[PDB]
Structure 1
Amino acid sequence: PVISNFCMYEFDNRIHAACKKVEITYTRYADDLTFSSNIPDVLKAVPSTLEVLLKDLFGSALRLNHSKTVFSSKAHNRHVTGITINNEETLSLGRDRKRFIKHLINQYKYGLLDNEDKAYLIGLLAFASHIEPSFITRMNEKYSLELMERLRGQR
């Protein structure tokens, strides 16, 4: 991981410098170049810049995945490295995952959830609390506070 991060330091620096001028923010989770902006029709030229910079730096060793270049807007689904971005411009787990978690908690309510699924639900709830703290409050309201407290356990 650290070698991979260092080998892309110059690429990250040059891409960030180019993107800040055109009001584009750039992040990379070591394989996922994410570019976003509020200016329309500004992200069209980003892939060409990426290709020319990669050819300048790494030659033919590192290449973009052209089948993995996706344009998205508020008209469609928007998720970055697993976190859905809402039309309200806030982080979310996605409606489908939230309904799955709700079903898991409902199954735990009637005692139809086994130990493996219970541990999976506890891990998912911790991840949700990290990502969507308001979802925990909503589940506390919907499924009562005592049920949630017994599900997460006590120290």
Structure 2
Amino acid sequence: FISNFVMYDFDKSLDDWCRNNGITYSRYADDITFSTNIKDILCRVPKVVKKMLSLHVPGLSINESKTIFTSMAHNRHVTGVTLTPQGNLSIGRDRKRMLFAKIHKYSLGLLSSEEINKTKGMIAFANYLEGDFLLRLQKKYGCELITKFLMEG
């Protein structure tokens, strides 16, 4: 809470500078992200943020070895959630096949009791992030098995 209260002026000053140029800005703990649609406009902000940091909170500085540029032709994610080119949030294909294989192996009764509690939390998180994971699972394995798995333990 103290850190959030401290970085108020920096947030306020950077917000109205980015708004006037059509750039979206957001900060999470000590991570800062910018995004836009205009070409060749994101190459000017590294000097601006440095001037703001020096002016509004003395002492802080930028780690210059963790700066990233990306577009629609490569992998895109924001703090652990993937953005498909269509414009929808996602968890990733590898995790989807992770869970589909785990549940299929569970249907044969070859899963330890620890992995049931392990997978239940991940399934709940994925359902919250997506909103339609449980429907797809029911449409593939049937409601009887899923309900039995859910009430297990």
TM over 0.5: yes
How far apart, CA to CA, are the structure 2 residues paired with 1:27 and 1:146?
Answer: 44
Distance in 1 of aligned mates of 2:79 and 2:26: 11
Equivalence for 2:129: 131
Q: Within 5 Å, which residues of 2 pair with 1:48-87?
A: 48-59=47-58, 61-87=59-85
User: Aligned pair count?
Assistant: 152
Distance 1:153 1:41, change over 3 A: farther
Check conservation: 2:81, 2:90, Cα contact below 8 A: yes
Change (3 A) 1:146 1:38: farther
Distance 2:92 2:57 in 1: 37
Counterpart residue type for residue 28 of structure 2: Y
Structure 1 gaps, min length 5: none
Amino acid of the structure 2 residue aligned with 1:144: G
Cα displacement (A) at 1:23: 0.9
Distance 2:26 2:35 in 1: 9
Asked whether the 8 Å contact 2:10–2:57 carries over to 1, the reply is: no
Once the two structures are TM-superposed, the CA of residue 145 in structure 1 deviates from its matched residue by 2.1
Say whether the 8 Å CA contact 1:128–1:136 is kept in structure 2: no
Deviation, 1:135, is 2.4
Matches within 5 A, 1:71-150: 71-150=69-148
Contiguous gaps of at least 5 residues in structure 2:
none
Instruction: Give me the whole-angstrom Cα distance separating, in 1, the residues matched to 2:119 and 2:44.
Output: 43
The answer to whether the Cα contact below 8 Å between 1:19 and 1:25 also exists between their aligned partners in 2 is yes
Query: Aligned to 1:14, what secondary structure does the other structure show?
Result: helix
Q: Which amino acid aligns with 2:143?
A: L
Give the Cα separation in 2 of the matches to 1:151 and 1:5: 42
3-state secondary structure, aligned to 2:65: helix
Deviation, 1:136, is 2.5
Aligned residue for 1:56, secondary structure, equals helix
Aligned partners of 1:107 and 1:18: how far apart in 2? Answer: 53
Superposed CA RMSD? 1.5
Q: TM-score scaled by structure 2?
A: 0.91
